From Swiss-Prot, chains A, B:
Stretch of the intact protein here: 746 to 802 of 893
Function: Required for normal vault structure. Vaults are multi-subunit structures that may act as scaffolds for proteins involved in signal transduction. Vaults may also play a role in nucleo-cytoplasmic transport. Down-regulates IFNG-mediated STAT1 signaling and subsequent activation of JAK. Down-regulates SRC activity and signaling through MAP kinases.
Expression (tissue specificity): Present in most normal tissues. Higher expression observed in epithelial cells with secretory and excretory functions, as well as in cells chronically exposed to xenobiotics, such as bronchial cells and cells lining the intestine. Overexpressed in many multidrug-resistant cancer cells.
Origin organism lineage: Eukaryota, Metazoa, Chordata, Craniata, Vertebrata
Gene this chain is encoded by: MVP
Organism of provenance: Homo sapiens (Human)
Protein name: Major vault protein
Domains: entry comment: MVP 3 mediates interaction with PTEN. MVP 4 mediates interaction with PARP4.
Compartments where found: Cytoplasm; Nucleus, Nuclear pore complex; Cytoplasm, Perinuclear region
Induction: Up-regulated by IFNG/IFN-gamma.
Quaternary assembly: The vault ribonucleoprotein particle is a huge (400 A x 670 A) cage structure of 12.9 MDa. It consists of a dimer of half-vaults, with each half-vault comprising 39 identical major vault protein (MVP) chains, PARP4 and one or more vault RNAs (vRNAs). Interacts with TEP1. Interacts with PTEN and activated MAPK1. The phosphorylated protein interacts with the SH2 domains of PTPN11 and SRC. Interacts with APEX1. May interact with ZNF540.
The record's account of how the chain is modified after translation: Phosphorylated on Tyr residues after EGF stimulation. Dephosphorylated by PTPN11.
Amino acid sequence: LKAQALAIETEAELQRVQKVRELELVYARAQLELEVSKAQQLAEVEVKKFKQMTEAI
Amino acid sequence: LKAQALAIETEAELQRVQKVRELELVYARAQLELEVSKAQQLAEVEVKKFKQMTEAI
């Protein structure tokens, strides 16, 4: 009887953990894209600033 | 009688451990792909910044 109750709690908990993980990966991939997009634009700002101040000298 | 009860708890517990392990490997492989994807993109940002600042001098 304990093996039946454990099988029920196992599948019920793993259905939750699977859905939480699917959503956290979708969000972490979107948040990664935002962090990379930030780094690409701010790195370009500093390269432009550096090149134009260098061309003045 | 103890050998029967032990065999029942053994198969019941190993059915849980197997399903937990199958899902943890699927998730850890997906999380690895995300960490590598982060490292590849952020390393490209730093390589671009370094090369363009070097070409200015």
